[PDB]
Design a binder for these strands. Structure first.
Lengths: 134, 57, 144, 184
RNA sequence: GGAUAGUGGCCUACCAUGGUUUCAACGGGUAACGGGGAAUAAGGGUUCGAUUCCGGAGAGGGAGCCUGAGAAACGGCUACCACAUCCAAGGAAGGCAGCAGGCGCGCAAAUUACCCAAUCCUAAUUCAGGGAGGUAGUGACAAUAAAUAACGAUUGGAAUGAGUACAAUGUAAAUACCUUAACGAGGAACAAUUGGAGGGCAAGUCUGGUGCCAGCAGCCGCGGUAAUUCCAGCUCCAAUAGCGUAUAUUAAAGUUGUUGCAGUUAAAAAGCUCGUAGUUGAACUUUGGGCCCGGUU
């Protein structure tokens, strides 16, 4: 936006997770809100690092516009981000692919149906087919 | 005297008169302002005492 | 010596004297015996649904003169029959025979109001519809 | 489950609800401060009564008592920081001498009016609640915003508010568009 | 001596006759899980505590038991009782006081939703699982803030949020919130109700209707052809997104009285005396005086 002037406070480094973490406040006067991708690329350019290494989340807009205050996170590589950032954040940024887990109800129904069967069930299927066709 | 029937005689027989249309009254702080400007600068009601709803005399 | 014991070791005597004397209190005895649970028609309840058995005209007490409209309601939850007042003009015509009516207290705790003899309860809802709503035309009685 | 979320009431309705003198005094206050309900005066009087109870229990304590000193200096410090009290009357007895008018006068409504950004107190409340007035540099729409002693100097129109030099609102834009359409 | 993981009448054999009690035992009721605490209170106190935390107990009742360190385990078995389901009539399988949800009971209480993203938990264990938990839906239980309008001239401009909505933030993904393109005030609009106007308890000696009828009324009371009290209109008042009603409880209640009640006549001094428990019970035993030290003013 206009005069974003992205500031990063409390920039304590985190060698344990191989990242630099900071609270990021962006001032966007005369603007609704600045998008996640724009903030990610701006932080990457300002930190001289790859865009996929940086990550930002939990952006709370102050009352009446002007600025939003949130949390920032930049890693030491892209593999570090891929291994430490969670799956939802990775698919949010597009660096990963959303899993196709079935919904909880039908997943649990499948679990119960498989639990009620003992073994691989090949013998059960063969016996059932023989009895039904006979 | 004696009424087991005729219950609601007056409520049924009273001549209906509709609520006449009047300018909408303000609500909230506006109504508080109306009350203040009706009871503290319009103190002309005094006749020895301040009558809040004087009869049309 | 003002009758009551004053000794520094008379705490038991004071406690027991108070225990005996508290029974004379109207509300304390009622709560302790649980007459609300035992004997009161509502069983200590703020309201009670019932089925009206018949309409009644109860003459008002002196110096008043009028025929207050009432209903003989048998409570669904208790089976006790109580007289209930229909407290608004013309609202008696709303209540019919065998209509489910909600009963509430009359304000005076277990007593009667003014010139009504022996009526301690009043109707609030008829077949789930409020008496004042039916009176002021805000609702329409299903009559089903 | 989750630990209970504690809450409290900010006022206390008075006994004998129907005193003519009390009603007249509270309506005087409401009319001359733009208060929407008696609840606002009730809340202000409840805060006053709470701090006065604390002040009386504090004055009951012996002088130079550690608790007395700590709580008294804290109370007067917060009072002067709010601005309800004044710097000259830094003693504790002036907390007792306080009236509800001081708290009602330290509100954002009346402080906007005193600063002069408003035609009336009601105009001040209207401007406050339409996100036009902004303390410091942030929009606030709280009529009862207790202004600090370093905030009245920075009370002014909001940067986003059309009266604060921003885009001229919506009705002005609509009428300007209508005028341009007619003149076209 | 057995039994226990272990002490122990926990059980067993022999022996003595003991143990509790008017300082309230035993028995009965509890609409009684206990507590941290809640409401209301000058001080004392009164009432409540099913319920977010701690400790108990239960899985329809009751007992027995396997496994296991840990169970009298019930989303583990065994039997009976009471329910209740599918049978092809020989058989078989259950315990929602978990989550939703249905019936019943009632005055009384929500969706058969999404997710392991947090807080944690478990397993072989970073990865899986978790109706634990979180999110959303219903939700005037209660709490916080606060729109229903402001100004100008004698009819006009200017502002805005409700309500939509590209977008982004938000989130596990979302809904809403915070922001914001654009749309979105002039009244018949974008319309605030709930109770009340004889007194306590401020607010009508206004009009029409009724005429001890209807009816109102917490209490006193109003109403029988001039209703300040009923039903309507207008006006006004109190509170106000809340207001009223019923029940219970607290203050008021010095009407529970230890603080702090009353007993001649209002309710109350037993007919009188004796007397155990209980409560209370005359004084007297080391004082006064000198010399210093060290604290605060």
């Amino acid at each position: 936006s206009d005069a974003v002037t992205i500031r990063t406070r409390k920039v304590i480094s985190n060698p344990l997770l191989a990242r630099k973490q900071f609270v990021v406040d962006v001032l966007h006067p005369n603007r609704a809100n600045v998008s996640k991708d724009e903030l990610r690329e701006k932080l990457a350019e300002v930190y001289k690092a790859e865009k996929d290494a940086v990550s930002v989340f939990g952006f709370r807009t102050q009352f009446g516009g002007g600025k939003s205050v949130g949390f920032g996170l930049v890693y030491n590589s892209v593999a570090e981000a891929k291994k430490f950032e969670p799956t939802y954040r990775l698919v949010r940024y597009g660096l990963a692919e959303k899993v196709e887990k079935a919904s909880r109800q039908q997943r649990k129904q499948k679990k119960n149906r498989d639990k009620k069967i003992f073994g691989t069930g090949k013998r059960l299927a063969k016996k059932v087919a023989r009895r039904n066709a006979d | 005297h004696g009424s087991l029937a005729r219950a609601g005689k007056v409520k049924s027989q009273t001549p209906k008169v509709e609520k006449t249309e009047k300018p909408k009254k303000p609500k909230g702080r506006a109504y508080k302002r109306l009350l203040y400007t009706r009871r503290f600068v319009n103190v002309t009601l005094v006749n020895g005492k301040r009558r809040m709803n004087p009869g049309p005399s | 010596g003002k009758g009551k014991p004053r000794g520094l070791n008379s705490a038991r005597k004071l406690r027991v004297h108070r225990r005996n004397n508290r029974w004379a209190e109207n509300n304390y005895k009622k709560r302790l015996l649980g007459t609300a649970f035992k004997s009161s028609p509502f069983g200590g309840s703020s309201h009670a649904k019932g089925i009206v058995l018949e309409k009644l005209g109860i003459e008002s007490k002196q110096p008043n003169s009028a025929i207050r409209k009432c209903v003989r309601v048998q409570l669904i939850k208790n089976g006790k029959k109580v007289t209930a007042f229909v407290p608004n003009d013309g609202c008696l015509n709303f209540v019919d025979e065998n209509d489910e009516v909600l009963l509430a207290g009359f304000g005076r705790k277990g007593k009667a109001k003014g010139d009504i003899p022996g009526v301690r309860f009043k109707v609030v809802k008829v077949s789930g519809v409020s008496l004042l709503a039916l009176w002021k035309e805000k609702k329409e009685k299903p009559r089903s | 489950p989750r630990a209970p979320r504690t809450y409290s009431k900010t006022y206390s309705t008075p006994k004998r609800p129907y005193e003519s003198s009390r009603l007249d005094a509270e309506l005087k206050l409401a009319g001359e401060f733009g208060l929407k309900n008696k609840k606002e005066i009730y809340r202000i009087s409840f805060q006053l009564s709470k701090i006065r109870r604390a002040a009386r229990d504090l004055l009951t304590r012996d002088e130079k008592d550690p608790k007395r000193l700590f709580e008294g200096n804290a109370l007067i410090r917060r009072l002067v920081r709010v601005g309800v009290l004044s710097e000259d009357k830094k003693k504790l007895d002036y907390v007792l001498a306080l009236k509800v008018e001081d708290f009602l006068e330290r509100r954002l409504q009346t402080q906007v009016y005193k600063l002069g950004l408003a035609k009336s107190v009601h105009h001040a409340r209207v401007l406050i609640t339409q996100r036009h007035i902004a303390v410091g540099k942030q929009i606030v729409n709280i009529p009862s915003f207790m202004v600090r002693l370093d905030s009245e100097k920075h009370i002014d129109f909001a940067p986003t508010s059309p009266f604060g030099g921003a885009r001229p609102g919506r009705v002005a834009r609509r009428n300007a568009a209508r005028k341009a359409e007619a003149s076209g």
